Design a protein around this ligand. Sequence first.
Ligand code: CLA
Ligand code: CLA
Ligand code: CLA
Ligand code: CLA
Ligand code: CLA
Ligand code: CLA
Ligand SMILES: CC1=C(/C=C/C(C)=C/C=C/C(C)=C/C=C/C=C(C)/C=C/C=C(C)/C=C/C2=C(C)CCCC2(C)C)C(C)(C)CCC1
Ligand SMILES: CC1=C(/C=C/C(C)=C/C=C/C(C)=C/C=C/C=C(C)/C=C/C=C(C)/C=C/C2=C(C)CCCC2(C)C)C(C)(C)CCC1
Ligand SMILES: CC1=C(C/C=C(\C)CCC[C@H](C)CCC[C@H](C)CCCC(C)C)C(=O)c2ccccc2C1=O
Lengths: 742, 42, 33, 141, 95, 80, 147, 74
Amino acid sequence: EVKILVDRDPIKTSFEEWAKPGHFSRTIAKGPDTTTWIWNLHADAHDFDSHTSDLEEISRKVFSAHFGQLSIIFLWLSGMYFHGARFSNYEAWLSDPTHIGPSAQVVWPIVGQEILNGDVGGGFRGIQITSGFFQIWRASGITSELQLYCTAIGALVFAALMLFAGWFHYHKAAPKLAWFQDVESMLNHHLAGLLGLGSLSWAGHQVHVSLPINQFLNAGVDPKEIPLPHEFILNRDLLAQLYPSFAEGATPFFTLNWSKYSEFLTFRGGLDPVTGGLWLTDIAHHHLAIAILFLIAGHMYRTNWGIGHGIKDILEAHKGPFTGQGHKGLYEILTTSWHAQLSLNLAMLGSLTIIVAHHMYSMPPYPYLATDYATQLSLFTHHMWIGGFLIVGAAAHAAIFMVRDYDPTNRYNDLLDRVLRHRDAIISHLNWVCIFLGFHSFGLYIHNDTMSALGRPQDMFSDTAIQLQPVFAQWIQNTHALAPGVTAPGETASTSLTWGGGELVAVGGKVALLPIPLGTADFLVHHIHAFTIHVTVLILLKGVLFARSSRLIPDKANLGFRFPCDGPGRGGTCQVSAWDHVFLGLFWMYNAISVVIFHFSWKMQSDVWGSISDQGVVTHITGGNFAQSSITINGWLRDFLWAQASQVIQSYGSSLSAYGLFFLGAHFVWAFSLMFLFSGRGYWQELIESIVWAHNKLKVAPATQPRALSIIQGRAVGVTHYLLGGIATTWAFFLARIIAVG
Amino acid sequence: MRDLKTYLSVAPVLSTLWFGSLAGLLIEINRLFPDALTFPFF
Amino acid sequence: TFNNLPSIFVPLVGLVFPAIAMASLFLHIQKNK
Amino acid sequence: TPPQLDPNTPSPIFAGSTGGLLRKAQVEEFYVITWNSPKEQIFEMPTGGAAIMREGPNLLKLARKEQCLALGTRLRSKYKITYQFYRVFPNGEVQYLHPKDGVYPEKANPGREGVGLNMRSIGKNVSPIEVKFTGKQSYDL
Amino acid sequence: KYGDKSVYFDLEDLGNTTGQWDVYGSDAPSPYNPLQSKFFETFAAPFTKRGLLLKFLILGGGSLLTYVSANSTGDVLPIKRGPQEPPKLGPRGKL
Amino acid sequence: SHSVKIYDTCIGCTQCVRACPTDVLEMIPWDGCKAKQIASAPRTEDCVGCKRCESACPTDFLSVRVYLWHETTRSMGLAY
Amino acid sequence: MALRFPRFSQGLAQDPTTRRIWFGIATAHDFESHDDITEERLYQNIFASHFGQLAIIFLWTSGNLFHVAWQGNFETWVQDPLHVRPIAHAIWDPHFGQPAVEAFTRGGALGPVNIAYSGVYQWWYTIGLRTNEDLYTGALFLLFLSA
Amino acid sequence: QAALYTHHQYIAGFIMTGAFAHGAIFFIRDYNPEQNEDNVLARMLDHKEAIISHLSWASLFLGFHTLGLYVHND
Ligand code: CLA
Ligand code: CLA
Ligand code: CLA
Ligand code: CLA
Ligand code: CLA
Ligand code: CLA
Ligand SMILES: CC1=C(/C=C/C(C)=C/C=C/C(C)=C/C=C/C=C(C)/C=C/C=C(C)/C=C/C2=C(C)CCCC2(C)C)C(C)(C)CCC1
Ligand SMILES: CC1=C(/C=C/C(C)=C/C=C/C(C)=C/C=C/C=C(C)/C=C/C=C(C)/C=C/C2=C(C)CCCC2(C)C)C(C)(C)CCC1
Ligand SMILES: CC1=C(C/C=C(\C)CCC[C@H](C)CCC[C@H](C)CCCC(C)C)C(=O)c2ccccc2C1=O
């Protein structure tokens, strides 16, 4: 059985614990002996597994914390919808969504920053946004600032609702461990109800709102004299004139005569030629079918009645050809460790974010998204970075599971023990394939540089040279270009047009995804990507597996997950902790995702994004220079970094001056991080003690004793500023370039 | 309100209040006296 | 034969002398009296 | 005290791992730890993984002293059993290592002598100029 | 006794406890034909002496390398061809 | 190998020995402190150099004191 | 003094690890920290090392002079100096492609060459040293000073 | 001229860094405080905090204001 299992008033709502800082632990709820107290206060702020050593209080804390995060996300959504309501050119963008830059931010004219309000178009002076929110709102059929305003008030209502819910589910009526530990119900509800009915209700919105309004806007209609969605619901003649399938009603549905519903739930593959997005009929059919799928999927696990599955019953009965006797005890560790679940969920959520980027650049689902090149670049770049970060967090929390929440005595698993046993084979073969990949990708780039510098372009690795053609990806493109004719006859066109064919869905003077070719350079850079991914996996999996013990430190789980070292002995143990491994995997995730988004931006600016002429020949942004310049690192330095970073230096003056500024400042903070990564706490503590002498000599000695940052905190500040500066440099570069060229 | 004035007395809350007030002061001065490079009032 | 002298010495200092020095210094590295 | 004279006692039930005796045992010294477990139970061994130590006497051969003493401290703190490990050179001559007096080193047993012990504060050490061009360092007078 | 039930510390048989086993070393006899073996044993014996093999390889590899580079015509490698083009003037006249 | 010399400012708290993962240190009897014991260092040849002994020494600066020196296979933390 | 390669230090020679190699390379010229060292022997090693450095300096200058005398256009540079490119030395790189031989041929040379951006042309021309035989004589004299 | 100026200035910065590194090596290896009590060299270590803190003032002032003006102009 799965009861409600909550208790009333576990924690008293009061500001007494607001007053005393660092109340949540033993060594912080005393007061600052030093300035390390503040850093250890913020560091252990959400380390609920360190505050209270029971899963009940931990689970209540993370539940109400998720409510706070949801309140924050709803508040942020309210902000975006409101800035789209009162501080935007959304109407002018709807009237002409090809020459009006999406803008939903206006600056205040105070210190000359008013020049950041650019001529985006539509009688509006503001900042051209890149979140693609205008494209979402055209996919929803908004067509009015009143609707954005009222959904902003609704998102504020939901933010207050989530904040009250967190307060209620911590302080007034909080669940106990019997409520969280049951997961068959959590999965059943999050499948059938969250994701099932969520997709169902979004398909209902689309069937009843998005499809008619977008068909009207595609036919050509001023958004002011467009009928409202409730007119489509109520006035049946109207929606029936849009789609006569509505005239029959749901007796098509309940008599299973769905063939006549194929006027608004088509399987019309490919992109909408009128607007460059996907077909919203296809998307409505999609969300409907996904709703049916997740609704039948959320009735799989046994919760309170006889039917269903036990996840314990599945995992403990899953024998197979390769270590199927295992899988026993995983229900124990996953229902008694929030860090295991956090690691797994972060891994899959970040991988889904990356899947999201890769499927949004190529199958642009919103109207007029593919031709807002800033929107496409920003979305792919963003979700790539988010996915990489979330995977690195999966590493961090796998490690925190391995150190703290791992007991072979009580909670034993055969598979995890077998992984820890041969972990040196794992890391050795992964180190090897990392070296192999580094060589046979980056050394190919170095060979290309040397040969092109020695005047031997016949000896390079290129299409006009020694060819390393991606035969497998080219074969997949050949199949999927021919898939809908034989293998998927329900589709009139392919799922995407990146495969091949005489398909080039231009909406105006802009391309929107012609077929992306795959040459030698794409082989090279895809193997660079496999390389950087494998090195990130090396570092992170190595920290995970060696979080507990090694041949160097066999008592590392007693030192903790997040400790600097075990001293200079054994030669040195400087970055032996699993925290240090995620800290290095962050740098390698940075390298990986940065070369990924560089590949993306250059490939699209050279082979896809561009203008289309009245004769029918496409002129790309860079001009197809990816197959000849992106084989050499000098070409990435010259034809990509030096060439595309002309708009960010000429940005000064026009609206993009901020992107110019945020270039250099980002360039700084990255370098500012190098003060932390290269150095060590000892030098800074001695400098600080000299400065403390200078302060004692003026009766201005502080009582919070100045201490240099912790070693781990120096590394954290370093990787933090490093990622911030590098990523903000790339963000300024990307957005300035693509807003100044497309 | 007891123990709210102690929280608002804490270094970050007090720093954000002081720097919000100070930044608004500087911002409104630069609105009143924009584009200043000299002190000509003597 | 003076434009041929670079062809004699650039390998002899760059390939042959490095092999000689690397071998000899690797033996000196691993010697035990 | 007389040492404990390492016998051929049994070993824990372990399925094997990649954390054993590679070459530091073939040509150099390797180590061996013996502990009397009152009952058969599972424990995280320092070479990665999880073994099941048997009831009565157990014996585990490890690659270095830190593995042995880490496992020993975890045994003495978690299972409260009395461990004692050795060092076995590849020709023999098993060396009794850990307690060295029967009682653990945190207890001030008499008989053990003062070695590595300066009768001065730490900042009364002479400077390196005093011991320059001499084989001695500033912490050996 | 190393072959007892879960005893792996036979002190006199310290090769089985340390892991001195030949994982793949076969003591099986000579598989090659003895005449082929005699041919290789007589024809490769000159290279057996190490101190005379290191010296030989040094003074033979360096000789062959400094020779084949010297008598390499301007068809194998282009550095020995020459410019084979009118030399262009540099910036600012030539400076 | 290493050189773990201790000084007479030790108070006999037995934390340097309770932190030592290689049994370098051991408390001996002594008459220079309230606890009447001091931490010797016979097995300096087993010292890895991790300085857990002096990250647990509650003196004004330090009593136990690790001076890194000639590194052997026991002092380089080598299981191979 | 010691056995293995860091003969000057029996602490690195008695190091089974690869740290021996590195630290014996690095601490080779730290005579103050070597075994069996005296102030006398330290000073004498310093003196002989200074001699070695002076020898290498004169050898490097002799190499500059020889490669400007042999492979340089110095006799042509002293005619029209501010419109003729210096030549540091020739180049025989067997990895060069024919375009790179066409490109690195500068200063009116029989083959590919490197442009002396070091100023030895200007300095030598200012202190006399007109013909290439003068630079040959200078390189011979600096070989003599190296010896 | 550019190669020469860059050469000699990087050489000079390195040589200066080495001058100071060898002063540190002198203070560790070769300095005898009992031989030079209260002299002009021990007085460095008597007030080293003042030197270090006023260098830490001058550099901090220069960086704050140089960077502030450069960023103002940016
Ligand atoms: C005003 C109402 C109120 C009051 C008086 C309290 C009072 C208390 N809460 Mg409760 N709580 C509330 C609302 C309230 N809570 C709400 C709305 C939530 C849902 C998020 C929670 C969730 C919650 C949890 C999960 C826990 C508490 C705990 C506590 C105690 C410690 C408070 C403390 O030191 O943190 C004071 C901290 C703050 C004031 C920080 C505010 C952080 C907010 C939520 C996010 C702001 C982020 C911001 C947007 C991003 C940064 C931007 C910046 C860089 C500019 C105390 C009894 C703890 C406890 O008793 O356990 C021992 C505990 O574990 N509370
Ligand atoms: C079918 C019912 C249902 C639905 C819709 C959800 C939905 C959600 N749950 Mg789950 N949950 C359910 C049943 C359900 N749960 C059950 C039965 C249990 C017990 C086993 C849990 C236990 C559980 C935990 C432990 C946690 C969640 C979390 C979440 C949220 C994840 C964030 C997200 O995707 O944002 C999408 C956002 C939205 C869809 C907006 C939400 C707006 C509505 C008002 C709330 C959804 C309905 C909800 C169940 C409340 C019912 C009414 C209430 C008055 C009783 C999400 C809102 C996590 C979370 O975010 O913490 C707050 C979390 O930590 N749930
Ligand atoms: C679902 C997401 C999720 C969740 C719930 C958690 C939860 C947690 N993490 Mg994990 N983590 C995540 C994602 C997540 N993390 C990701 C994506 C990464 C990769 C970077 C990590 C990497 C990571 C490490 C390496 C560690 C944790 C730790 C922790 C714990 C304590 C964190 C804390 O108190 O800091 C409270 C919050 C802060 C101190 C603020 C952080 C400030 C960030 C880094 C600056 C960036 C802000 C912004 C983008 C920059 C501009 C700012 C502007 C003002 C200038 C807690 C269990 C720690 C732990 O458990 O150790 C015992 C730990 O050591 N996490
Ligand atoms: C450009 C800078 C750079 C380079 C070249 C490397 C190189 C490497 N890193 Mg490092 N790393 C760097 C920066 C760099 N790193 C930074 C800034 C960080 C900050 C955190 C790290 C952190 C880091 C970690 C944490 C890890 C690595 C790993 C690796 C290796 C993976 C690739 C490999 O071996 O393939 C082959 C070698 C290369 C691709 C390197 C370039 C060599 C090119 C291809 C040509 C070689 C020419 C040839 C040998 C001729 C030589 C000349 C001749 C005279 C002898 C390799 C040694 C991983 C590792 O060692 O395990 C596999 C690992 O786990 N690195
Ligand atoms: C450290 C380097 C540095 C320096 C010297 C300056 C200097 C200046 N900047 Mg630049 N700036 C800098 C860094 C710097 N900035 C950085 C780092 C940035 C990026 C964040 C900027 C960004 C920036 C912008 C964007 C702007 C400036 C502006 C200015 C001018 C300020 C005019 C103003 O509002 O003050 C007026 C005076 C005050 C605000 C002080 C008032 C103090 C209160 C009222 C108390 C005084 C009275 C007191 C009681 C005593 C009375 C005496 C007695 C009766 C008691 C001035 C020339 C502005 C300008 O005009 O451009 C030239 C402008 O628009 N700066
Ligand atoms: C761009 C990179 C960078 C920067 C800015 C600095 C800056 C500094 N270094 Mg250097 N350092 C660097 C790289 C850098 N370092 C590297 C790569 C290394 C090698 C490890 C070192 C090694 C090093 C040593 C070894 C020493 C320094 C020292 C210093 C300080 C010198 C005094 C000075 O100029 O202060 C003026 C202040 C600045 C230049 C700081 C810039 C930031 C602005 C002005 C502050 C305000 C920004 C903003 C409003 C804050 C809001 C953000 C956030 C709260 C949301 C200063 C903090 C010395 C020191 O600290 O003693 C004084 C010192 O001894 N650094
Ligand atoms: C945007 C947004 C917003 C809003 C939103 C909305 C407005 C939503 C809605 C939603 C909705 C409005 C939903 C609904 C749903 C529904 C459903 C999901 C249904 C289902 C049904 C079923 C399942 C059925 C069954 C059956 C049948 C079939 C018939 C008869 C019988 C029965 C009943 C059994 C806000 C403000 C928040 C803010 C943020 C953002
Ligand atoms: C104006 C003029 C003039 C004058 C001038 C003057 C007077 C100047 C001065 C200048 C100066 C006044 C400079 C200085 C420099 C310095 C330096 C550069 C320093 C350095 C230092 C160091 C490097 C250190 C080291 C060490 C240590 C650390 C400790 C131990 C000891 C020793 C020392 C070793 C006349 C009229 C004549 C002429 C014209 C111009
Ligand atoms: C720069 C640096 C420091 C010194 C950095 C300091 C101590 C941290 C920065 C602290 C700030 C400047 C403190 C001041 C903020 C206070 C809240 C005061 C606010 C009041 C006014 C200043 C507004 C380290 O301690 C360190 C440690 C280990 C590895 C690398 C490094 C490292 O690179």
